């Protein structure tokens, strides 16, 4: 009868129909949407349980610059940010706290270091004059958080009161059992309920730029649950 | 010159360079494609067990992995490549394994969730789901590795020869 | 939809983006303030056991570690920013974190002595001592962080709601 | 009365005549038999257990190339390639994947990466034309087993059915507790009877070279077995 | 003051710097000799348990390590330099140790197989095997080190004065 | 009453006055005193216990050399030299083997690798030649212990007979509770009693040098102790 | 034993090193230690009682 399976913010055992995602907002600091997972027709019931269900939830944003003659190797950020689960290195991380990309010259951006302490980081290369670039670094200082809807768009709970902070998410390393994030809260659903994740930050995440080099879909969400078939 | 009688239940392992599995390039967005299809061979039993360590290394062509948002997904069928909803195990992600010390680190070792077993004529598939716009996957740069065999750590695959125990025939 | 009734003593954590808590920045050959001050918020008990993680990640303002040889005590207080002598918990050197690992690792994972309560209107301090000719402490920067919920290893920092509880009132005068 | 010693592919405890080394075949991929130990007259009896003892082998090949004016700073290869444990780092390895020397230069070579995907290796340096190099890479693709013979060339028996592959055995990080590896299979013998170590895989793997840096044995064998005197 | 009575059985290590211990240089296929060798200071015994941790980390005159095909064989003596087959312990090769992190990591630490034991005159020796055609050792950088003091990880030497105890002489008569 | 602190190699909660740091000697080999600590006034007593007190003690030494004209880039050194805790990369160490700075100009000098084999380290930069340099790499074979002295430079007893290298004491990975290294010994002591912390080692160590980046105090001991308030 | 002594900011029966002064600070608003006397070796312990000593400080 009942199974331990992961879904993502795309298809999976649902179908890409059932899923839905979103973006946040930056003037008003609000409690958004910017995912959420309607029960199919198919199943019978979905569950979900903290300290038994693992989770992954990598987020990002965009920033862009303007090249200039001058040699910058350096921007400054809107955001921010310290390394993945801490270290000056880069290459060491279980991923790249930042990535880069020019227009002009469609390849990939190394990136040798930060300070980690204001919004800053380093580019290794030497953008040229009038080149147009793209940035997608880590993301930091928000909230995350969960509710249930039933089928109208109309909350009847909320599964963990207190909201727990993507900083600490990305400062963790995650996928070590032991280490792994497991929430609280114990809820389960039915057919055509939705359960929705919700972002308070001001920073504006994304989740596809279609110029992206490691893989299409910047962010991503992957979180166990358990399914009654 | 003196061998011990080992007991039946041989502890192993699967991997590509063996006859009872193949496998077949795949592009994208394929979900009924198996990239890779194991069967049971002629008079043995095979016993993969619910603690059994798992481990996908799929490649793209030129030596690079995969969207991590890709999906893995064991699962058994019966027979005539038919799939079942019962019985299925691992359904993961292609994401999130650190590839580098997956084998080596019992930490990185992910598992599976429930128990399995292989009558002799049986099938077990590898659907793998992979977003548009990605790269493929290629063969040969491709594997699959299950069971821990040769350390103290992880599980192994347990076979046996059918024709030997009698009660083989009720397990099966 | 279905919710469980979750009990009342609820697995929490606390860190700097809360309302109930406030730093200041720090200067040198300085013990007197609390660089970062906890209250009771109203109407709630909070509880610490005596194996609670502990974790100041302090920083210099240009973004460096501080000379190890800096101390920091954790101290509970009467009201009134009165502190006391017993109840004191994690007398603790700046140094021999490894503030990479340091929650990260049960090893480095420096717990409390011995056990703690907050009662609904009480304080918990957070002095420091640096010493002289040395860089100050920057508070965009610094970070406390006590508990450990999300994972199986440490423990976590207990609440509850006053108001639920009728023996609240018993536990809060057995501090 | 028991021991637990180390067996090497020279010498040790026997003293190198009671040994045998010996190549592969690479047209007829054959099981052959690489290397084999007979025991000596002095002993009473060897014994031999799975999960018991402990193991290493790291076999190598040779390959060379012809020095031209073309920067070359590459070679394909014959045989497939990949890191020692996995990493895409040199220098980081439990040993080199590869080792290079040039004939002319008498020195070392190192080596900065590889593809490890297809049959690919880079080199550091910038070989002249006409000089000449000879290479060790790693071996992969192959089969290893044991057997053993009473005193005539005559098998009686096999120490485990199903053969291991010499890819997963460089996959695995060796000389690790826990980690270790340690076959199936408990044999013993007596006085004069052998166990051999037997190989199928097409490259041509090597015992001696004598321009090899590290070490003059290029490839080795160290295996754990128990001794009764 | 004060200090406390430590017991009898005093946890200790060896190393080349101690007056019990010798050693000299070593060319190639040459088993004989010690290239170290150790014996039983007076009126004392040393113990070595069964998982004692062992760490040679030998060296080439030019700073190098050697083949790792070379072999290292601890084995105890009876007087006079008399090898015996029965109580040898540690035959491993000179390769797979990763030095870096040889005494470092408890996976590394390779300890021994079988007990052993030192009467107040007894010897042990460390022959080495290298393959011909290779470069010989130097005991200017060469080291040995058994035992693990100062680590909750590995075993320590055992020491006792043999004047001490009474049984002192029934255990070495046991050895 | 008692308490569990740390103390420095400089003022803590003693004052800068009852402690007192010293060089060793180098031609002949003795057991000096670098460091001892002095019970003041106000306490009641000290004690000091083995495992349970842990420990730190990072020491150096100073070289310099000349500059020229050859692109030097590698320096020999005249002390026995290993990685910190073993590695061949630099900035994954808990801190780094060695440092360097340049007189002429007051810049940090990085560092890429060495061979740790013989006494050998490279140099990322070009120094000039004329140029003055200073380096203070990790030290190597020595000894440390403890004794006692009751006020008039007149031994009583020592701690623990037999002396731990400051090698091994390099070698394993400081600041690890399990991991971490507590030696042995029961000392004890009241007012104006002086324990003394002693070298036996060739190389000549340094405490100050006025012109170190990383921290004022070149080495440095940090001690655990219990203390009657 | 028992005496009623008066303490001022400069040596008296102490011998101005066990006292220290110190300024206060303007721009942090802060409980600052503008004086603090220790008991010395010789004393066997001091006493302070409200209601019961006087005081000034200008």
Same mark, same amino acid.
């Given at each position: ?6 879904? &993502? %913010? ?7 129909s ?5 973006? &946040? ?17 198919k ?58 990309y &020019?227009?002009?010259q ?5 990136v040798?270091d ?55 998410? %990305? ?10 994030? &497991?929430? %609280? ?6 057919e055509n ?5 919700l ?31 | ?12 392992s ?6 009872f ?7 994208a ?7 890779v299809?194991?069967?049971?061979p002629?008079?043995?039993?095979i ?31 019966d027979?005539?490549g ?9 359904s ?9 010390k ?21 099938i ?49």
């Amino acid at each position: 009868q009942t199974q331990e399976y992961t879904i &993502n %913010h795309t298809g999976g055992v649902l179908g890409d129909s059932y899923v839905t995602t979103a973006s &946040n907002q930056t003037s008003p600091q609000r409690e958004t949407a910017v995912l959420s997972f309607e029960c199919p027709r198919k199943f019978e019931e979905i569950n979900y349980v903290g300290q038994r269900d693992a989770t992954r939830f990598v987020p990002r944003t965009t920033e862009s610059i303007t090249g200039s003659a001058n040699d910058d190797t350096v921007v400054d950020l809107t955001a921010n940010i310290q390394p993945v689960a801490g270290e000056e290195v880069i290459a060491e991380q279980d991923y790249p706290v930042a990535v880069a990309y &020019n227009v002009t010259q469609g390849v990939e951006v190394d990136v040798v270091d930060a300070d980690y302490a204001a919004d800053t980081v380093t580019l290794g290369t030497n953008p040229a004059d009038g080149d147009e670039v793209k940035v997608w670094p880590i993301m930091s200082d928000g909230d995350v958080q969960f509710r249930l809807i039933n089928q109208f768009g109309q909350e009847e709970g909320r599964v963990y009161p207190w909201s727990t902070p993507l900083y600490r998410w %990305h400062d963790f390393p995650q996928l070590k059992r032991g280490r792994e994030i &497991n929430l %609280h809260g114990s809820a389960s659903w039915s057919e055509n309920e939705t359960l929705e994740i919700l972002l308070d930050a001001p920073q504006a995440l994304t989740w596809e730029d279609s110029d992206y080099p490691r893989g299409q879909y910047v962010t991503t969400l992957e979180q166990d649950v358990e399914i009654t078939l | 010159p003196e061998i011990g009688n080992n007991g039946a239940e041989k502890q192993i392992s699967l991997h590509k360079g063996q006859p009872f599995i193949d496998t077949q390039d795949v592009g994208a967005a394929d979900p009924n494609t198996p990239a890779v299809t194991i069967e049971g061979p002629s008079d043995y039993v095979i016993a993969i067990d619910a603690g059994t360590p798992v481990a996908p290394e799929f490649r793209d062509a030129n030596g690079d992995k995969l969207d991590p948002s890709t999906r893995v997904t064991i699962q058994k069928c019966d027979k005539q490549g038919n799939p079942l909803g019962d019985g299925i195990v691992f359904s993961d992600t292609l994401g999130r394994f650190e590839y580098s010390k997956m084998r080596s680190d019992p930490d990185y070792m992910r598992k599976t969730t429930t128990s399995l077993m292989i009558d002799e004529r049986e099938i077990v598939k590898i659907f793998v789901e992979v977003p548009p716009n990605a790269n493929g996957m290629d063969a040969d740069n491709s594997r699959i590795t299950i069971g821990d065999d040769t350390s103290d750590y992880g599980k192994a695959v347990g076979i046996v020869e059918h024709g030997d125990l009698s009660p083989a025939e009720s397990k099966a």
